[PDB]
Structure formats: C-alpha cells, structure tokens
Scaffold this active site. Structure first.
Site, short mmCIF file in Angstrom:
data_model
loop_
_atom_site.label_atom_id
_atom_site.label_comp_id
_atom_site.label_asym_id
_atom_site.label_seq_id
_atom_site.Cartn_x
_atom_site.Cartn_y
_atom_site.Cartn_z
N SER A 1 0.79 -1.21 0.00
CA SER A 1 0.00 0.00 0.00
C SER A 1 0.83 1.27 0.00
CB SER A 1 -0.95 0.06 1.19
OG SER A 1 -1.86 -1.04 1.12
N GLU B 1 -0.39 10.07 4.59
CA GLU B 1 -1.11 10.46 5.80
C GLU B 1 -0.17 11.30 6.66
OE1 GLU B 1 -2.84 6.94 7.54
OE2 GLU B 1 -3.46 6.22 5.57
N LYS C 1 3.46 6.36 5.56
CA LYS C 1 2.60 5.33 5.01
C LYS C 1 3.17 3.92 5.28
CE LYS C 1 -1.05 4.08 2.62
NZ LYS C 1 -1.29 2.86 3.47
N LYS D 1 0.26 3.61 -2.92
CA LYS D 1 -0.76 4.66 -2.96
C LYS D 1 -0.16 6.05 -2.91
CE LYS D 1 -4.58 2.08 -0.84
NZ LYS D 1 -3.96 0.80 -0.36
N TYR E 1 -10.63 3.27 4.91
CA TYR E 1 -9.48 2.95 4.06
C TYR E 1 -9.87 1.89 3.04
CZ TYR E 1 -4.64 1.75 2.85
OH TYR E 1 -3.45 1.52 2.19
N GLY F 1 2.87 -0.18 4.29
CA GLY F 1 2.47 -1.01 3.17
C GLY F 1 2.89 -2.46 3.32
N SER F 2 2.00 -3.37 2.93
CA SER F 2 2.31 -4.79 3.02
C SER F 2 1.72 -5.55 1.83
CB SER F 2 1.67 -5.41 4.28
OG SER F 2 2.01 -4.65 5.45
#
Length: 359
Positions: free
Chosen positions: A63, A270, A313, A66, A149, A315-316
């Site tokens: 993620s 964010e 941010k 994004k 989300y 992310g996985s």
C-alpha cells in the site's frame, strides 16, 4: 549533530533485535539525514538461494504504492487535467447510478465516498465487471462524512485521474513520476530481466510473491531501497523537483483534506502534526483503528503542506512489510523494506526510535 558512526549504531541496534523478534529474513533501510541517503542492509533476500539483501534488492511496497498514485493524481491536477472537486462521473460517464451524485474525485482519493469497501472483489476482472461493481454499490454513509481505508476508493481514483492523459496508469506513472525523478528500478510487474534482484517474501516460512484493474494503483509497486530513498527525498523537499507540475503534485499529495482524530488524510500520504509522541503514531497504526470507519472533519479549502508534520505510510503484501516516514521541518526520513509482513506498530516504533535519535 549525530555522526554517521552513531547513526549506523542506532540503525543496527534497532533493526537487529526487530528482525529477530519478528522473524524477518531480510531488510533494507535508508535514513535521509544531512541531505543524503544512508543505506543499511541486513539478512537475506532469498533464503534457499542464500542471496543477501543489497541496495538493488526489489521489495513489494504494498500500500505504499498509494503514495505514487496520490502524487500522480496531484500532477494531473496541476496540469489542469482533473480537479478534486469534479464529480467522479465527469471521468466515467457510464457510471449512471444516482448514488454517485455528490461524490467527488476527492472522496475517491481520500476514502470518504461513503463506504467503498477495502477490496475490489475477485469477480471484477474487466471494465464491464468494474462498472457493475460500482453501479451496484450502495453507500452506507453520505459523502464526506466517514473515512474507510479502501483500495476500491483510491484505486478507482487512480484509474480515472489518468484518463485525460490518454495513458494507462502504469505508463502515466512511469512517464510523469518515475522517469523525471530517475526512479529507473521501480516497477509494477518486474521485467524478466530484473528478476535476479527480486526478493522472495516470506509468510509462515514459505517463500511467496505477489500475483502478476486497480491493483497497480493500490498495492502493486516493487522497488529497491535506493529508488525509495530518492522517492522520500523528493516528497520531503519538492523545492528541488524541477518539473513544475510534479512539484505541485507532490505538495497536493501532502495537503490536508480531512482530519480524523490525530491524523490528517492526504493523497496516499497520511500526516500527523509534529511534534508527535510515539504512542500516538503507534496506536493509530493498529489495524483495528487503521481499517475502521471513522468520522471526518473537512479541511476546506485543503491545507497546503505543513512542514512540521510526521508524513508516513505503511504497506504490506502477503510476503512483505514496509514503512516510510519523514519530517520536512527537520529534513529527516526513513525507509524500511522487509520480506516478511510483521505488525505495523512494530514498524512505526522502530522508525520513530531511529528518527528520534536524529532530532
């Protein structure tokens, strides 16, 4: 004025216990400090083949993808191709269901359309099924009231944002964001030729990789720690980005559009106001919070980037877990790429500890 020697100690002393406790095979870390990236590599990219992590190892960002979507959309806004205040239907006239009236491009980009779900379901495989999915969707909330989300939200934003350009998402992203920033080893599908650099992810002891629509936009990017360090530097200091629309797009992605408790929603990115204590950030990273539907407060007009911000941010993917965070006021930042998905709060705690050492 922490020395490079001391920084190296802090990173090793943080990461080595983290990798042991979380069973992480390999990690690549970049710390941005004093105007340059500092690279630290640990462990194995491929256990069976005994390949070490190097600065060229590719990791799945999940993620964090994004953030690239957000900046690409920002770039499109700066070009005059789209506006966040446009209705979604401007960019998809076939989306005729009346529940879409009043839903803006902004709402797709920032998860406030009114309950679009986390995932696009697996029966969506083509434009006809994408259309059917969004036509059938019944909002649980009015627009601009609840943040949930959602890949089904920002993913569609990314697809629609590139329509005026005439390019598919991958090409638009490569042409307008990656190539200008010299991110030449950042990929959606990894070319056969680059396969030697691709790490394996690890899940419950098994080597795994992501399967080969809206996925690129939401979680599909692969990159190495050098490109990611340079990505963080560009976002930290857009004053040094020469392309005028790209520079503006980076700022639009770090603008505040909504307040949700102690955080603010950007485009992908964010933010929390700096200074922020570790528990604030760590507690917000827990999935029970991060995936919850929460009320929003509009920031209207959006607030331009605040230098005193923690910008981040997580992310996985099935096999990978990564985190990026930076503080523009202090011109410090970090990238942590790993080939196992370990808990988000542990990522934040480690990153915070390292950056704290520098402030």
């Amino acid at each position: 004025p922490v020395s490079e020697k001391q920084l190296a100690e802090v990173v090793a002393n943080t990461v080595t216990p983290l990798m042991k406790a979380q069973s992480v095979p390999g990690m690549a870390v970049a710390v941005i400090y004093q105007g340059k990236p500092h690279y630290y590599t640990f462990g194995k990219a491929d256990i069976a083949a005994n390949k070490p992590v190097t600065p060229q190892t590719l990791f799945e960002l999940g993620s964090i993808s994004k953030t690239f979507t957000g900046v690409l959309g920002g770039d499109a806004i700066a070009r005059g191709e789209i506006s966040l205040d446009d209705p979604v239907t401007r960019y998809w006239p076939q989306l005729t269901g009346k529940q879409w009236q009043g839903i803006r491009m902004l709402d797709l980009a920032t998860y406030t359309a009114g309950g679009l779900p986390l995932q696009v379901p697996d029966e969506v495989t083509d434009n006809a099924s994408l259309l059917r999915f969004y036509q059938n969707w019944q909002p649980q909330w009015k627009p601009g009231t609840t943040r949930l989300y959602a890949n089904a939200s920002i993913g569609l934003f990314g697809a629609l944002a590139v329509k005026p350009s005439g390019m598919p998402y991958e090409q638009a992203m490569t042409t307008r964001v990656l190539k200008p920033l010299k991110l030449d080893h950042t990929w959606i599908n990894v070319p056969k030729a680059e396969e030697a650099h691709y790490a394996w992810g690890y899940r419950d002891g098994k080597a795994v990789r992501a399967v080969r629509m809206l996925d690129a936009q939401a979680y599909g990017v692969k990159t190495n720690v050098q490109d990611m360090a340079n990505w963080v530097m560009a976002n930290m200091a857009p004053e040094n980005v020469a392309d005028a629309s790209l520079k503006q797009g980076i700022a639009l992605a770090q603008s505040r559009y909504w307040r949700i408790g102690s955080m603010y929603q950007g485009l992908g990115w964010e933010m929390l106001n700096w200074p922020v204590e570790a528990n604030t950030v760590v507690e917000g990273s827990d999935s029970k919070v991060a995936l919850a539907p929460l009320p929003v407060a509009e920031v209207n007009p959006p607030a331009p980037p605040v230098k005193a911000s923690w910008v981040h941010k997580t992310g996985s993917t099935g096999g990978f877990g990564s985190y990026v965070a930076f503080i523009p006021e202090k011109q410090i930042g970090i990238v942590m790429l790993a080939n196992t998905s370990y808990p988000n709060p542990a990522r934040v705690e480690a990153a915070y500890h390292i950056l704290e050492a520098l402030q």
